[PDB]
Each structure stands twice: as C-alpha cells, then as structure tokens.
C-alpha cells in the first residue's frame, strides 16, 4: 500500500502519520530524526604553513 | 424455525474486487437458537455462505462480493427481510490470478 | 426450564438450551464451552483450552487464579484485578486510600482497615 | 483529586451565636473516595473545618 507524507526536519520532533486503508483498521506510524548531517563537496586548492 | 423480528442490515466495509470484499452485519431479535438459510435476492451481490447460526445475542455477519459502485440488495434470514445499501471504493491491485 | 425434547442444557447452572445437534459440533454454543467438553476422547474442542503440556482444560479454568494446566499455562497472559499501589483492599473487596488504614475510623464496611491483624496492634 | 458533580447545599439548623451554631449538609456524586478541601467564599459565615 503506497503512501506519501511530508515530515519536518527538526531533531527530536515526534512525527506521527495516519494511514487509513479502506479495507482495514487505521494505522499510526512514528518517525523521528535522531541525527542529521550535511556534507559538502570539497576541492583542495593549496596548503599553508 | 426461529422467529426473526425487526431485522436491520448495515455494511461495515465494501470494496468491489474479485475476491469477497464485503462485510455485512445483521441485527435481529429471536426467541430460540437455530439454523437459518441466508439468501440474497439480487445478482448485484453474491453471498459466500448459505446458512448462519442465529443466537440470542442478536448479531450475525456475512461476506459478500460485488462489482458495482453502490449496491442495493434484499437479504433474507429464514423468513425475515431487509434492504442493504453501501458505498464501495475501487481496489488498488491491477491484476489477480483468480 | 426443562429444555424441549430436541434441546440439551449447557450445564446444571445454565438456563441456555442448545439443539442436540450443537453438542460436539466444534463451535462453543454454551456460555461455558461445556458442549465441546468430553467429545473426541480428550481431543481438545472449541470450548476447551490447550495447556502447553497438551492437556485440555475447560475455557472457564483459564485465568481462574488456579493452576489447572499443571504447568501454569492457563494462568499465563491473563489480567489479575486488585486495588492501586496507594489503595488498601477491604475484605469486602472495596478499595480505600492506604492513608485510611488504621486511623481509628471504620472506612471499610466490614472494619477490615481497622482489623487487629492488619493494624499490627 | 476526586471528581465531584451535582453539589447541593442544605441547612438543617442555624442560630447566630458566638460558637459554631449551624449544621451544614452537602449531597453530591463522586467517582472515587478521598480528601477534599472545604472553604466558604464569603466572610458572613466561617467554617469550622
């Protein structure tokens, strides 16, 4: 059963999603962002000392 | 035969798919516990079972399969009657092997 | 109520009469499941609980506070009721605050709270 | 705290004397039994307890 949602990028925020299938009882998921990391791409130019 | 009075019909869920995708619940009032022959009087919906156990509790369930967007059929339980109408949503599976 | 000539009673304390065809039919038609007891020899039936030992007990012996399964399987996954962690149980089964135990007032209808055995007086 | 609903107040006897010369009766419906705090919101009458 395909589903789609949008959840905030806030660490520790307890996002809960409601999935309501027509033939079955509704379901609630819980997703949480424990940790995030933003990695740039680097090209070394030179070294100084 | 058990005496059935004040028979009402409601549909829990419906989905017009090839398998039996309908749940039908009947409320009734009885004096004794026995066996009733259940039939549906239209070919828009097809029941799964022929007989049901009627008890003093006052609730039996039936499974039916339909292919119309909104069915409406008259179901009988021994001698009683009722009119069930429901709203069914289409199924998601494109292809089935049965 | 004597059941009709084609009906059997669901035990000595049940007012429920089932058809003679509903005794050992594989469904629990009796409130106690006694209709499914003593059918296929010991063969467990819909009115009986299967102990982890393989023994059949009546479903009425599941969660009765006694080890009828001899392995305690009938007393596993039950739900025992009592008073809260801050309440005292009177011998009449009423719950009072633990603060009202041995306060020289009869808050239990049977004076269990003021009982000489409980108050250690 | 216990939940109290449908509070009705009746006075059996009264006598405006120096000592506590009144008797007060309260009827209610509760869910559990415990301790409540009793106060009178006007200074015309002073509760003993």
UniProtKB/Swiss-Prot annotation, chain C:
Glycosylated. It is found in: Cell membrane; Membrane, Clathrin-coated pit. Residues 7-29 are annotated as: (Microbial infection) Interaction with Semliki virus spike glycoprotein E1. Disulfide bonds join 3-17, 10-30, 24-39, 44-56, 51-69, 63-78, 83-95, 90-108, 102-119. Residues 1-41, 42-80, 81-121 form the LDL-receptor class A domain. Abundant in heart and skeletal muscle; also ovary and kidney; not in liver. Glycans are attached at residue 41. Changing residue 29 to A: Complete loss of interaction with Semliki virus spike glycoprotein E1. Multifunctional cell surface receptor that binds VLDL and transports it into cells by endocytosis and therefore plays an important role in energy metabolism. Also binds to a wide range of other molecules including Reelin/RELN or apolipoprotein E/APOE-containing ligands as well as clusterin/CLU. In the off-state of the pathway, forms homooligomers or heterooligomers with LRP8. Upon binding to ligands, homooligomers are rearranged to higher order receptor clusters that transmit the extracellular RELN signal to intracellular signaling processes by binding to DAB1. (Microbial infection) Acts as a receptor for Semliki Forest virus. Homooligomer. Binds to the extracellular matrix protein Reelin/RELN. Interacts with LRP8. Interacts with LDLRAP1. Interacts with SNX17. Interacts with DAB1. Interacts with PCSK9. Interacts with PAFAH1B3 and PAFAH1B2, the catalytic complex of (PAF-AH (I)) heterotetrameric enzyme; these interactions may modulate the Reelin pathway. Interacts with STX5; this interaction mediates VLDLR translocation from the endoplasmic reticulum to the plasma membrane. Interacts with CLU. (Microbial infection) Interacts with protein VP1 of the minor-group human rhinoviruses (HRVs) through the second and third LDL-receptor class A domains. It is linked to Cerebellar ataxia, impaired intellectual development, and dysequilibrium syndrome 1: An autosomal recessive, congenital, non-progressive cerebellar ataxia associated with disturbed equilibrium, delayed ambulation, intellectual disability, cerebellar hypoplasia and mild cerebral gyral simplification. Additional features include short stature, strabismus, pes planus and, rarely, seizures. This is Very low-density lipoprotein receptor. It comes from Homo sapiens (Human). The gene is VLDLR.
């Amino acid at each position: 059963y395909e589903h789609s949602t949008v959840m905030p990028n806030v660490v520790g925020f307890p996002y809960k999603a409601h999935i309501e299938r027509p033939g079955y009882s509704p379901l609630t998921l819980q997703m949480q962002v424990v940790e995030t990391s933003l990695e740039p791409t680097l090209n070394l130019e030179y070294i100084t000392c | 035969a058990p005496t059935i009075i004040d028979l009402t019909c409601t549909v829990a869920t419906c989905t017009h798919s090839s398998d039996f995708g309908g749940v039908l619940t009947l409320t009734y009032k009885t004096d004794k516990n026995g066996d009733c022959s259940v039939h549906s009087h239209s070919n828009v919906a097809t029941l799964q079972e022929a007989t049901a156990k009627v008890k003093t509790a006052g609730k039996v369930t039936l499974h039916f399969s339909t292919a119309s967007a909104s069915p409406s059929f008259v179901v009988s339980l021994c001698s009683a009657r009722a009119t069930c109408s429901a709203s069914c949503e289409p199924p998601k599976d494109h292809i089935v092997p049965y | 109520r004597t059941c009709r000539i084609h009906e059997i009673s669901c035990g000595a304390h049940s007012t429920q009469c089932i058809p003679v065809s509903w005794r050992c039919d594989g469904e629990n038609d009796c409130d106690s499941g006694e209709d499914e007891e003593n059918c296929g020899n010991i063969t467990c039936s819909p009115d009986e609980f299967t102990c982890s030992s393989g023994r059949c007990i009546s479903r009425n012996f599941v969660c009765n506070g006694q080890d009828d399964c001899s392995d305690g399987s009938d007393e596993l996954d039950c739900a025992p009721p009592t008073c809260g962690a801050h309440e005292f149980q009177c011998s009449t089964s009423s719950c009072i605050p633990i603060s009202w135990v041995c306060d020289d007032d009869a808050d239990c209808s049977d004076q269990s709270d003021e009982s000489l055995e409980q108050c250690g007086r």
